[PDB]
Structures are given as C-alpha cells and as structure tokens.
Design an enzyme around this catalytic site. Structure first.
Site, short mmCIF file in Angstrom:
data_model
loop_
_atom_site.label_atom_id
_atom_site.label_comp_id
_atom_site.label_asym_id
_atom_site.label_seq_id
_atom_site.Cartn_x
_atom_site.Cartn_y
_atom_site.Cartn_z
N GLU A 158 0.98 -1.14 0.01
CA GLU A 158 -0.15 0.05 0.14
C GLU A 158 0.95 1.08 0.18
OE1 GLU A 158 -0.49 2.49 2.46
OE2 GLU A 158 -2.56 3.34 1.78
N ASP A 196 -8.65 1.39 7.50
CA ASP A 196 -7.27 2.03 7.53
C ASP A 196 -7.05 2.90 8.60
OD1 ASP A 196 -4.73 2.66 6.79
OD2 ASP A 196 -5.25 2.85 4.60
#
Ligand SMILES: COc1ccc(NC(=S)NCCCn2ccnc2)cc1OC
Ligand SMILES: [Cl-]
Ligand SMILES: [Zn+2]
EC number: 2.3.2.5
Length: 302
Positions: A158, A196
């Site tokens: 990511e 997240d």
C-alpha cells in the site's frame, strides 16, 4: 463538503434483539492484543519481518479452516528497486459466487533512518480482521458452504517508497485489481470494505460513496443499537468531493462498490514514528472491532 445522509439511505440493524445481544457479547480482548503485538513490528516489503507478519496472518486463518491464497508478484519501486509483493486472500468458501470483502494493508511504510511501526496504519486493522475470524468462528461456519461468503484481503505494498503518486503507491491493490478484472473475478465482490488508520482516539467516519451509503448507514445503526444497549464515531453525513487515495482506488475505478472505513481527519500521528504502541486507544479499538464484527454478521447472516 458534508451533506446529511437522506432517509432513503437509512438501513437499520436487522438482527433479532436476542442474536444482536448474543453476538455483541462475543469477544476475545486478549487475542486482539496478542495479534496487535505480533503484527506491530517494522514490516517493510521484502524484509524478514514482512514475511513473518504474512506467515502469521496466513497460519492464523488456515488454523481456523480458511482457504488462503497468496498472490505473489514482482514490481519496481523507487529506492528499493525490484520487490516481491504478496497479497493475502483468505476465504471461508473459496467457491462462493459472491463475497463481502473486508480488507486492509499489512506492509509498513519505509522511512529512511527510522523505524516506523504503523500502529493505526495498519497493524490494528490487520489485528481486527484476524480477531474477527477468531471471535466469530462458530457463527461463520455455514459461510464455508454458502453462495455468499466472506473474504479477508490483506493488501501488500500500500505505502509509497519515495513519494505517494500513481506509480509509487498501492502496488498490491493495483496488481490484484488488474488481475481479477482480467479474470472476470471483480463482479463477485458485493462490496470491498477497506479499514485504514484505526486504533487512535476519537475517529470520525463519513460515507464517501453513494452506492454504499445504505450499507454505511447499517454500520451507523449497529453503533446506535450498541449505544442504546449500553455496550460516537459514525456520523450520519456524506463527504462529497473527497478524493482520498488508498487500496480501494483500482477497484473503485473498475465499478466495485467501496465502503472506506478511514477517519477524517487522519490521526495526528499519521506517517510519524509516533504511530506506535503508545497511540493505541484500547477502548476505541475494542469498540470499533465490535462494531465491525456486528456489521459483518448483519450483512452476511441478516
Ligand atoms: C494528513 O491528512 C491527509 C493526508 C493526505 C490526504 N490525502 C490523501 S490522497 N491521502 C491518501 C492516504 C494514503 N494512505 C493511507 C494510509 N497510509 C497512506 C488526506 C488527508 O486528510 C484528509
Ligand atoms: Cl526484518
Ligand atoms: Zn500510511
């Protein structure tokens, strides 16, 4: 801009009171804290610890009888050069027609000259998903055979290695979204829920996407119902013209409905070494993990 969510999108909790009460009392605080401790190590792509964290996730889910596929591939990053990335795809039914997908990233950001632990970003999210599998293992059993099942997806790479941009970010998600698009395997995703930056105090959530606003409102309702039963984060507002980039972007661009569970504003420690064990608020963490567990049960079991 924030807009109030219209009534058409309201979608209250549907579990019977007894089942809601029963399921809201399932937890394993010790396991959640153990998972956090195991994952909360520097875990830059290509490092020994990165492999250790992947092995922990893979073995934990395999031990709970999940089918686990590792999607491994090479790509070039600034600074680091050629790296082997490894997305982790765990399913209760590997032959399902449809999935609810809960997801997060397991890599930690490369920060020259300092250790970066990424507690909220995203060690805690990763731990919440492993803990979900552990805590709900009895309730999830039928999903090993059902047409609609559950997938836990741990994206790799990511984080940017030099500077966040289209060619230096979301390596694993871009690869996997392209692969599954090519393979006709995106249509089977009912919704991709992306966790997240969770674990810090006082997060505030908003709905980002109109096509998932109704399912956002189911989470909002789960939170309200827990409060009423005395056991707020989710605002009844939508954030329009929000262009927050994350692992969901390559799926969003290919018509996959996204529920993006990320607080706005981001935690104040974001991308500093202060995103560590000390920032974790365990009351908020236990709370959010419970809300997410109940959301999953609401969607899957009804
Ligand atoms: C500092 O607060 C912010 C910083 C940047 C952005 N904009 C974008 S596009 N962020 C993409 C984040 C990708 N990511 C997620 C976890 N680790 C990296 C918005 C912010 O507040 C709304
Ligand atoms: Cl290491
Ligand atoms: Zn980050």
């Amino acid at each position: 801009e924030l807009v109030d969510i219209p009534k058409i999108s309201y979608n209250p909790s549907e579990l019977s009171e007894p089942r809601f009460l029963e399921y809201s009392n399932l937890s394993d605080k010790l396991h959640l804290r153990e998972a956090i401790d195991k994952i909360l190590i520097p875990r830059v792509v290509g490092t020994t610890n990165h492999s250790i964290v992947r092995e922990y996730i893979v073995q934990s889910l395999r031990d709970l009888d999940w089918d686990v596929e590792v999607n491994s591939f090479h790509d070039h990053a600034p600074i680091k050069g050629k790296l082997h990335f490894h997305n982790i795809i765990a399913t209760l039914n590997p032959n399902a027609e449809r999935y609810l997908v809960l997801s997060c990233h397991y890599d930690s950001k490369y920060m020259p000259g300092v250790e970066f632990l990424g507690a909220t970003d995203s060690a805690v999210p990763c731990a919440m998903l492993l803990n979900l599998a552990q805590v709900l293992q009895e309730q999830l059993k039928p999903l090993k055979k059902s047409k609609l099942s559950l997938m836990l997806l741990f994206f790799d790479g990511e984080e940017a290695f030099e500077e966040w941009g289209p060619k230096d970010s979301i390596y694993g998600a871009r690869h996997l979204a392209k692969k599954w698009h090519h393979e006709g395997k995106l249509d089977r995703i009912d919704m991709l829920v992306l966790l997240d930056l969770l674990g810090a105090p006082d997060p505030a959530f908003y709905s980002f996407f109109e096509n998932t606003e109704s399912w956002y409102m189911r989470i909002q309702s789960v939170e309200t119902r827990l409060a009423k039963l005395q056991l707020r984060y989710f605002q009844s507002q939508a954030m329009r013209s929000s262009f927050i980039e994350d692992d969901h972007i390559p799926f969003l661009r290919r018509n996959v409905p996204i529920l993006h569970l990320i607080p706005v504003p981001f935690p104040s420690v974001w991308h500093t070494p202060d995103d560590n064990a000390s920032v974790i608020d365990y009351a908020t963490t236990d709370n959010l993990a419970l809300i997410i567990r109940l959301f999953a049960l609401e969607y899957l079991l009804a």
